[PDB]
C-alpha cells in the first residue's frame, strides 16, 4: 500500500529534523544552493526528497510560524509522485503545496501552481512568497491585468502562481505570436493544481476560446429584440424547463412571418433572420438578469457558473451577447470570430508531470484514472473532525425557506455566533440581504458585484457576531479564521441555501467551517420549487407529493421527498459525467489536428533559414497540380496540357515561361522535375535579388498568414459539422467514426490549401 | 448610422451619358460594393458602341462611399453623413496639354441601389492629342485623394492628380478638382484633411462579346 510508503517517508523527514532548528539563517539559503549544485551533479529529486522536505518544514517554522504536520509531509510526498492527494477541507493544503513545489523548482524549469480564481492565487502568492523567498527561489504571480512583459517576467521565475484561465490563454496567445521572443510561457514542466475537482473535472468541460473581432451588425439585433419583446409568454414561445431551450410555437412562427413581412422563416434565404430570433428569444427568457450576468457601466459582464466571480473580458458567442446587449438597450458592439480553441484536459495533459489536491476527490476517483492516469491517494486528518454536519431541511415553497433561514440567522446572531449563508446566485443573495435589512441585523453581502472589497470581508467574517451572505465566491478556497471567543460558542455556523450540482461542491461549502479541530455547525435548507428540483426531479414525486398542505411552518418529515432530492442530485451528476465522456472522445481528434498544426508553425517560427520548407510546400503543390491535370484513367496525349501550362504560367512561373512544346507528351514525373528545376532557379535568383534575411522574413510572414487564416476556417468548419454529426446515427453509423474520418479529410484539404497559398504568394510576388 | 446600415453588399448601378467634340457616348454597368472590406467589383458595359475617350479617362468619373474604415476615423467621414439622403459631385478635370472635362454627376441611393447618374461634357479639345488618339494603356494606377471641407458651401472639396500610362511610354498628369454636395440636410460631418489611398485593376471577361470594361477596386482612407 502506498500509504505505508508515505508514512515511512514522513517518519524519515521527522527523524532527520534534529540537525535543523538550531541551524541559523544564511545556512538554509546555502542549502538551496547546495541542492542546486548536487542536482546538477548527478542525483535526482527522489533522492533529494527527505532533506528538501526537512528544510522546508524548518524554514516554514521560522518564517510564518506554521510548522508543518505529519499528514502534510504525507501530502507533499503524494503530490511529488504525480498522485492527487485528497486532504479534507481545512487540513492545511496550501502549506503542503510548498513541499513538492520547492522540490521540483530546484532543477530549473517552471512550476505552475494553478488555482481556481485570482483571490486565492494572490492570497497564496503573498503568503508563500515569504517561504519561497526565504530560500532564494523567485515567485512570479500571474494575473489578468498584466502586459506581456510582466507576464514573461512572472513566468520566468522559478515558481508561478496563477489561475487556469490565465495559463490557458497564455498558451493560446503564445501560439498566435509572430516572433519567437513574444512568447510568455516557458516549455511546460509541472503543475500543482489546487482544487483539482473544479479545474480537471467540473470546469474541464468548457473550452477556452480566443476570438478576434469581425464586422458589426446592429440593425438585425434591434429588429429581433423589438419583435420578441411582444410575444405573450407561453402562447407563442415555449420554454423547456429541464434544459433551457426556447422555441417558437406554431402561432409565433406565423406572427414572425407577418411581422417581418417575409414568406417563410424556415427557408434558406432567411437563415440569418431565424438565427437572430432564436438568439433574441434566448436572451429574454432563458437567462435572467442578475442570475448569470450583470450590467457594469453599459457592458454585460457574464458571471461564472463555477467560480462565482464575474469574468470581465469574456463574451458569449454565436451572436448571443449582442442579443443580451440589445435586450437592455446597451451599446451593441462587434461580433467575435474564433481564432484559437483548447480544453482543460487537452491543455493540462501536456505538462510532463502534474499533481493536485482537493478535499472531495474520491467521488470521481476512477475518472482521474480514466482521463489523466493519476490515482487519488487518501490522506488522514491529524485531528478528528468535530463538525456537526446536520441533515437537510426540505421545505415546500421558496419563501418559506427564506423566512426560516432569516429566523435561523437571527437566532444565531442573538448568541453572537458567526453565520456564513451560502447561496449560488447574486439576486438571491441580495434578496436574502433585504430579508435581513428588516429584522435588523448587520451583515456583509459578497456578490459578484462586491468583489472589490471582499478580501477584507473575510477577515471580518470570523469574529463575534458577524453575518456574511456569500455566493459561490466564498465557496471553495476561503479560509475564514475564527476570531476570539468564537470557538467557545461553536464557531461559524454555515447555513446553506440550496443544493449544488455535486456532493463535491456542497461538501466543500460545509468544509468552510470544518477548520482544524474547531467546531462548526453546518445546515442545508431546501425547497421543492428550488430550481434544481423543478429542473431535475422526476414527475413520479412532484405533483404526487406537493399535497402536504401549504403552510411551511415546519420542514417536511417524510423520506419520499428526501429520496427525491438525492435522486435529483445524482442524475445531475450523471448528466455531467455522460457529457464529459462524450466531449472527451470528440475533442480528442482536434487535439491531434491542433498538435500537428501548432508543432509545424512553431517549427516555421524558430528556424534559421526556411528555404527548404517552402520549397517542399511548392513541390507538394506542384505534384498535385500535375497529377490533377494528368490523370491515370485517361491514356496520354489526351491530358489537356493547355490548362496545365496555363496554371503553371499563372501560378508558379510568370506568364511566358512555360509553353506546351516544353512538355508535349512526357510522363508526368519528368515533366514535374523539369518544372521544379526552373522553380528552384527562379527562387534562387529571387533570393539573391531580394536579400538573405529579408526573404526569410518575407516567407515567414506569408507562411504564418496562410497557416493562421486557413486554421481559423478549419476550426470553424469542424465546429460546424460537430453540431450535425449526431444526426448521422440514423444511418446507424457510430457518429464518432464518421466525425473522425470526415475531419481527417477536411484537415487534409486544409493543408492542401495552405500549400497552394504559400506557393502562389511566394512566387507570384 | 445611414451607411453603417449598409455594411452588407450594395448594388451599384452606373449610368453615363456624355459628349466630347459633338461625339456621343453612353456607357452603363452594374456591380457590388462593400464597406467593411471596402471594395468595388463592377461589371461595366459600353452600350452605345465605341469609346470616344478611353476607359482610363473614364474611371475617375465612374461612389467614394465604399471605403474601408478602421476604428479611429469613424468620426471623420463625410460620405456617411449625406447618405442615404443622396450625394452630388461635379469635377473640373484639367488635362495638361489638352482640354477640360466638366463632369456632372449625382450619386445617390435611388430606392435601395447606389445609382451614379453621370453626364460628362468635355470641352476645349483638339482631337489630335493623346486621349482622342486613344494612346492609353489598359491600366489604372494607385493614388491618394486629398479631402478637405468648406463651410461656406458646407461641402467637400477634393484635390488630386492622376497619372495615366500613355502607350508611347509617357504619362498624362491630369488634375481633378472635385466638389461634393449633400442632397439632404441632416447631420453633416466635415472633417479635416485626410486621404483615400486607392488602387484599381482593369481586366476583361473571356466569355463576353462586346467592348466591356471590368473594374475591380480597393479604397482605404488614412490621415485622421
Amino acid at each position, epitope marked *: 500500500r502506498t500509504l505505508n510508503r508515505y508514512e515511512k517517508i514522513a517518519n524519515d523527514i521527522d527523524a532527520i529534523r534534529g540537525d535543523y532548528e538550531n541551524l541559523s539563517d544564511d545556512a538554509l539559503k546555502h542549502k538551496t544552493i547546495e541542492f542546486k549544485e548536487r542536482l546538477e551533479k548527478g542525483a535526482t529529486t527522489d533522492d533529494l526528497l527527505v532533506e528538501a522536505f526537512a528544510v522546508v518544514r524548518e524554514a516554514s517554522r521560522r518564517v510564518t510560524g506554521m510548522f508543518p504536520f505529519k499528514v502534510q509531509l504525507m501530502g507533499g510526498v503524494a503530490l511529488h509522485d504525480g498522485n492527487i492527494a485528497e486532504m479534507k477541507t481545512g487540513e492545511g493544503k496550501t502549506l503542503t503545496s510548498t513541499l513538492p513545489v520547492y522540490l521540483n523548482a530546484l532543477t530549473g524549469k517552471g512550476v505552475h501552481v494553478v488555482t481556481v480564481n485570482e483571490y486565492l492565487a494572490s492570497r497564496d502568492a503573498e503568503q508563500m512568497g515569504k517561504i519561497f523567498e526565504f530560500l532564494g527561489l523567485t515567485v512570479g504571480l500571474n494575473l489578468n491585468s498584466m502586459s506581456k512583459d510582466e507576464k514573461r517576467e512572472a513566468y520566468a521565475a522559478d515558481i508561478t502562481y496563477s489561475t487556469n484561465n490565465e495559463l490557458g490563454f497564455d498558451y493560446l496567445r503564445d501560439n498566435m505570436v509572430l516572433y519567437k521572443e513574444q512568447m510568455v510561457q516557458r516549455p511546460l514542466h509541472f503543475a500543482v493544481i489546487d482544487e483539482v475537482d473544479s479545474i480537471l473535472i467540473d470546469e474541464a468541460r468548457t473550452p477556452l476560446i480566443i476570438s478576434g473581432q469581425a464586422a458589426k451588425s446592429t440593425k438585425l439585433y434591434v429588429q429581433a429584440n423589438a419583435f420578441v419583446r411582444t410575444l405573450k409568454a407561453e402562447k407563442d414561445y415555449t420554454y423547456d424547463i429541464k434544459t433551457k431551450a426556447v422555441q417558437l410555437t406554431e402561432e409565433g412562427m406565423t406572427k414572425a412571418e407577418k411581422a417581418f413581412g417575409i414568406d417563410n422563416l424556415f427557408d434558406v434565404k432567411h437563415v440569418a433572420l431565424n438565427h437572430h430570433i432564436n438568439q433574441a428569444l434566448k436572451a429574454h427568457v432563458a437567462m435572467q438578469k442578475d442570475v448569470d450576468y450583470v450590467v457594469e457601466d453599459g457592458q454585460v459582464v457574464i458571471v461564472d457558473s463555477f467560480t462565482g466571480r464575474l469574468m470581465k473580458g469574456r463574451r458569449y458567442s454565436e451572436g448571443l451577447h449582442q442579443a443580451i446587449e440589445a435586450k437592455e438597450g446597451l451599446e451593441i458592439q462587434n461580433e467575435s470570430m474564433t481564432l484559437a480553441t483548447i480544453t482543460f484536459q487537452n491543455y493540462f495533459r501536456m505538462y510532463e508531470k502534474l499533481a493536485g489536491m482537493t478535499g472531495t476527490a474520491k467521488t470521481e476517483e476512477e475518472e482521474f484514472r480514466n482521463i489523466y492516469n493519476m490515482q487519488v491517494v487518501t490522506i488522514p486528518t491529524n485531528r478528528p473532525v468535530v463538525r456537526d454536519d446536520r441533515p437537510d431541511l426540505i421545505y415546500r415553497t421558496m419563501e418559506g425557506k427564506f423566512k426560516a433561514v432569516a429566523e435561523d440567522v437571527a437566532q444565531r446572531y442573538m448568541t453572537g455566533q458567526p453565520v456564513l449563508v451560502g447561496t449560488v446566485a447574486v439576486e438571491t443573495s441580495e434578496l436574502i440581504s433585504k430579508l435581513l435589512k428588516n429584522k435588523g441585523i448587520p451583515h456583509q453581502v459578497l456578490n459578484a458585484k462586491n468583489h472589490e472589497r471582499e478580501a477584507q470581508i473575510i477577515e471580518e467574517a470570523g469574529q463575534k457576531g458577524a453575518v456574511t451572505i456569500a455566493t459561490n465566491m466564498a465557496g471553495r478556497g476561503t479560509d475564514i479564521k475564527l476570531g476570539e471567543g468564537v470557538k467557545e460558542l461553536g464557531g461559524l455556523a454555515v447555513v446553506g441555501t440550496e443544493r449544488h450540482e455535486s456532493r463535491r461542491i456542497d461538501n466543500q461549502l460545509r468544509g468552510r467551517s470544518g477548520r482544524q479541530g474547531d467546531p462548526g455547525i453546518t445546515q442545508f435548507y431546501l425547497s421543492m420549487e428550488d430550481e434544481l428540483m423543478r429542473r431535475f426531479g422526476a414527475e413520479r414525486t412532484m405533483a404526487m407529493l406537493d399535497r402536504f398542505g401549504m403552510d411551511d411552518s415546519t420542514p417536511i418529515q417524510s423520506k419520499m421527498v428526501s429520496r427525491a432530492v438525492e435522486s435529483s442530485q445524482k442524475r445531475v451528476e450523471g448528466n455531467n459525467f455522460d457529457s464529459r465522456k462524450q466531449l472527451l472522445q470528440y475533442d480528442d481528434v482536434l487535439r491531434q489536428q491542433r498538435e500537428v498544426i501548432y508543432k509545424q508553425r512553431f517549427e516555421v517560427i524558430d528556424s534559421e533559414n526556411l528555404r527548404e520548407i517552402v520549397e517542399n510546400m511548392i513541390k507538394s503543390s506542384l505534384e498535385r497540380a500535375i497529377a490533377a491535370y494528368t490523370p491515370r484513367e485517361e491514356l496520354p496525349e489526351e491530358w489537356k496540357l493547355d490548362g496545365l501550362v496555363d496554371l503553371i504560367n499563372t501560378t508558379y512561373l510568370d*506568364e*511566358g515561361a512555360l509553353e506546351k512544346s516544353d512538355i508535349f507528351g512526357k510522363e508526368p514525373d519528368e515533366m514535374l522535375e523539369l518544372i521544379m528545376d526552373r522553380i528552384i532557379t527562379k527562387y534562387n*535568383e529571387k533570393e539573391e535579388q531580394f536579400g538573405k534575411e529579408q526573404m526569410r522574413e518575407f516567407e515567414k510572414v506569408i507562411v504564418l498568414r496562410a497557416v493562421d487564416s486557413k486554421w481559423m476556417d478549419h476550426i470553424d468548419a469542424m465546429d460546424q459539422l460537430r453540431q450535425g454529426i449526431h444526426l448521422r446515427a440514423y444511418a446507424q453509423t457510430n457518429p464518432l467514426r464518421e466525425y473522425q474520418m470526415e475531419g481527417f479529410a477536411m484537415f487534409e484539404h486544409m493543408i492542401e490549401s495552405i500549400e497552394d497559398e504559400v506557393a502562389k504568394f511566394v512566387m507570384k510576388a | 448610422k445611414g451607411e453603417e446600415l449598409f455594411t452588407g453588399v450594395v448594388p451599384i448601378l452606373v449610368e453615363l451619358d456624355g459628349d466630347v467634340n459633338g461625339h456621343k457616348f453612353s456607357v452603363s454597368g452594374e456591380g457590388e460594393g462593400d464597406a467593411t472590406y471596402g471594395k468595388l467589383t463592377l461589371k461595366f458595359i459600353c452600350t452605345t458602341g465605341k469609346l470616344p475617350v478611353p476607359w482610363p479617362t473614364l474611371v475617375t468619373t465612374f461612389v467614394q462611399c465604399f471605403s474601408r474604415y478602421p476604428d479611429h476615423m469613424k468620426r471623420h467621414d463625410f460620405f456617411k453623413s449625406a447618405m442615404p439622403e443622396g450625394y452630388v459631385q461635379e469635377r473640373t478635370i484639367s488635362f495638361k496639354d489638352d482640354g477640360n472635362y466638366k463632369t456632372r454627376a449625382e450619386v445617390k441611393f435611388e430606392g435601395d441601389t447606389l445609382v451614379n447618374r453621370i453626364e460628362l461634357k468635355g470641352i476645349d479639345f483638339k482631337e489630335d492629342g493623346n486621349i482622342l488618339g486613344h494612346k492609353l*494603356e489598359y491600366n489604372y494606377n494607385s493614388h491618394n485623394v486629398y479631402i478637405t471641407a468648406d463651410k461656406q458651401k458646407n461641402g467637400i472639396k477634393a484635390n488630386f492628380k492622376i497619372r495615366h500610362n500613355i502607350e508611347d511610354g509617357s504619362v498624362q498628369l491630369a488634375d481633378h478638382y472635385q466638389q461634393n454636395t449633400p442632397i439632404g440636410d441632416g447631420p453633416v460631418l466635415l472633417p479635416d484633411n485626410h486621404y483615400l489611398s486607392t488602387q484599381s485593376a482593369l481586366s476583361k471577361d473571356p466569355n463576353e462579346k462586346r467592348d466591356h470594361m471590368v473594374l475591380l477596386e480597393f479604397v482605404t482612407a488614412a490621415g485622421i
Partner: nanobody
Amino acid sequence: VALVESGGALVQPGGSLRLSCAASGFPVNRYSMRWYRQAPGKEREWVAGMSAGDRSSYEDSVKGRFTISRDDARNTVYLQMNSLKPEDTAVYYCNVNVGFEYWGQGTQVTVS
C-alpha cells in the same frame, strides 16, 4: 513583383553613373517599364518610360541624354544618365503596373 533599384550614390558633377532596377515576378518584354524622379518636397515627377517593345518616349527637359534599356535575359532595366547636372539630385524610382502599380525601394542620386 519586386522592383529593386541599385547603383546610386553621391557624386560630384561630371562622373557618369549607371542605374539598375532588377525586376522579379514578371517578364519585362510584355509590360511597359518606367522611371520617375523626385526631389524632396517636389512631386514625384516623370522621367522616362519604355512601352512593351521597340520605342520609348522621354520628357522634353532631359532629352538627348537618358537611355532606358533592358536585359530581357537578366529581367532587369537599366538607365544611363551621361553627364550630371545638379538639377538631377533626386530620389529616383523604377515603376511598373502589372495589375497593381509597383514602385521600388527608392534609390538616391545626389549631384554635389
